[PDB]
Amino acid sequence: GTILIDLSPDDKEFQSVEEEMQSTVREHRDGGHAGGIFNRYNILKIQKVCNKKLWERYTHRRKEVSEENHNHANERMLFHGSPFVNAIIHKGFDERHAYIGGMFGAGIYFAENSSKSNQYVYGIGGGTGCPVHKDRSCYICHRQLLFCRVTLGKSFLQFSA
Amino acid sequence: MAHSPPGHHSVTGRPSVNGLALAEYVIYRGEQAYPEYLITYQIMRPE
Numbered sequence: 001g002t003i004l005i006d007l008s009p010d011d012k013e014f015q016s017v018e019e020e021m022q023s024t025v026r027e028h029r030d031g032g033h034a035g036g037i038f039n040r041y042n043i044l045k046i047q048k049v050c051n052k053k054l055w056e057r058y059t060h061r062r063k064e065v066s067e068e069n070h071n072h073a074n075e076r077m078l079f080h081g082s083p084f085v086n087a088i089i090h091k092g093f094d095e096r097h098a099y100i101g102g103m104f105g106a107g108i109y110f111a112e113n114s115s116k117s118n119q120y121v122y123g124i125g126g127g128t129g130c131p132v133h134k135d136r137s138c139y140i141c142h143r144q145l146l147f148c149r150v151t152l153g154k155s156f157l158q159f160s161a
Numbered sequence: 162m163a164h165s166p167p168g169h170h171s172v173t174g175r176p177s178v179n180g181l182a183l184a185e186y187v188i189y190r191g192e193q194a195y196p197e198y199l200i201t202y203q204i205m206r207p208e
């Protein structure tokens with residue numbers, strides 16, 4: 001039941017999503033090893049993901065969290081990069097999209113820096129890079145990220161390197 | 162999937178070394194996220 005609606009670059013929604021993508025690039029301590037060497041992106045397309053069933057599943061859970069946290073869902077918009085973006089948009093997030101080895105345990109990870117999610121597009125640590133050229137810094141091949149609505153509720157603060 | 166720390170719904174990974182890094186977040190229930198935009202892009206070679 002998923003449909004994808006193209007946003008026009010003239011659309012204010014296209015523009016605000018593009019700006020969050022571009023403005024949250026940073027340099028990475030691997031010197032580009034995982035995600036490539038770049039300061040900015042060439043945005044090719046932004047599509048709205050529309051699935052009624054997946055939306056209702058999110059809003060149901062959002063209300064539960066909110067009622068457990070003085071009516072505060074603590075909702076954010078955050079980036080997710082994954083080799084499984086096509087399965088996610090059709091079936092939703094589930095245990096198969098977890099980072100089993102992540103530093104905060106087996107869960108589904110999101111980033112405020114778009115450039116941090118970019119490091120996972122081709123797998124953990126960038127895998128072997130693009131399928132076509134085996135290049136983690138490929139400037140040719142098309143990449144995809146998700147910009148997601150995430151319910152944090154009461155969040156455990158982990159100070160960390 | 163693991164569980165959230167008791168009495169919590171997510172984990173916030175606060176950067177404590179790299180002063181320029183923003184936060185990363187973890188959730189342990191798939192129903193706590195909706196993939197709202199699909200962005201297709203290329204990274205650009207710096208000049």
Ligand SMILES: O=c1[nH]c(-c2ccc(C(F)(F)F)cc2)nc2ccccc12
Binds near residue numbers: 082100102
């Ligand atoms: O966007 C992210 N994706 C992933 C991520 C990690 C692993 C996998 C999978 F194991 F390939 F399913 C898929 C996505 N990890 C992150 C860690 C920190 C901040 C952001 C991310």
Ligand SMILES: [Zn+2]
Binds near residue numbers: 133135140
């Ligand atoms: Zn390539």
